[PDB]
Amino acid sequence: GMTEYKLVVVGAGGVGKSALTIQLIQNHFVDEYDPTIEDSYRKQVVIDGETCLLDILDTAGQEEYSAMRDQYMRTGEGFLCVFAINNTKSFEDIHHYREQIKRVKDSEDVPMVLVGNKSDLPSRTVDTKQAQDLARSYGIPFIETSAKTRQGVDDAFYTLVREIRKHK
C-alpha cells in the first residue's frame, strides 16, 4: 500500500506557510494567498524512490488552545516550524510552536524540521548560525527555503518525511 504522511506547516502569520505549501502542490510561487485560509492539500511524490502520498495541512488564524483544535493538530505526524529570515519575532516564536506540538502529541519525540523561509531576500535579521544553533539545541534538522525561487522546498518536506520514517 502507498503510505500517506500527514504533515502540518506552522509558524507565525506571514512567514510563508501558504507560499511553501503551494510551491510543493502547484510548483508555482503564489505571493498572495488569503492569510485566513487554513486547509489541506495532497500530493503524490517519490522520496528516495518510494511513491508516497503527502497530506499537507497549511495552518492559519488565531491561536486557540481547545480540545477541538488540539485534536485537529494531533492528526499531524510531522511538523514544519517556519520562520522568516527577515522577521526576528517569527524566529523567537519557534520554541512556542515546538512546545505546543509536543504537548498535543503527548510525546517528547515528534518529527519536526525548522524552516528559515524567504532566503531570497537581502533583508536578513536572523543569522544562519543562530537558526542552525536553535535546530541543534532541539536536535532537529534546519532547512533554508525560499517559496519564491523554490530553494529548499522539497528538502524541507522530504526531510520531514525522513524524520517520520525514523520515528515510525
Ligand X SMILES: Nc1nc2c(ncn2[C@@H]2O[C@H](COP(=O)(O)OP(=O)(O)O)[C@@H](O)[C@H]2O)c(=O)[nH]1
Ligand Y SMILES: C[C@H]1CNCCCN1c1nccc(-c2noc([C@@]3(C)CCCc4sc(N)c(C#N)c43)n2)n1
DSSP for 87-122?
-HHHHHTHHHHHHHHHHHHT-S---EEEEEE-TT-S
x-or-dash pattern for ligand Y, window 71-110, by CB under 6 A? --x-------------------x--xx--xx--x------
Q: Based on CB atoms, which residue is closest to Mg ion, 19 or 54? A: 19
What's the Cα-to-Cα distance from 2 to each of 5, 46, 51, 65, rounded to whole Å? 10, 11, 7, 33
Query: Which strands, in side-by-side order, build the sheet including 142-144?
Result: 39-47, 50-58, 4-10, 78-84, 112-117, 142-144
Is residue 31 a contact point for ligand X (CB under 6 A)? Answer: yes
Stretch of 10-18, 42-50, 127-135, 156-164 contacting ligand X, by CB under 6 A = 10-18
Smallest gap, in angstroms, from Cβ of residue 29 to ligand X? 8
Smallest gap, in angstroms, from Cβ of residue 50 to ligand X? 28
Q: Based on CB atoms, which residue is closest to Mg ion, 45 or 60? A: 60
Instruction: Give the separation between CA 80 and CA 155, rounded to whole angstroms.
Output: 11
Smallest gap, in angstroms, from Cβ of residue 17 to Mg ion? 5
Is residue 61 a contact point for ligand X (CB under 6 A)? Answer: no
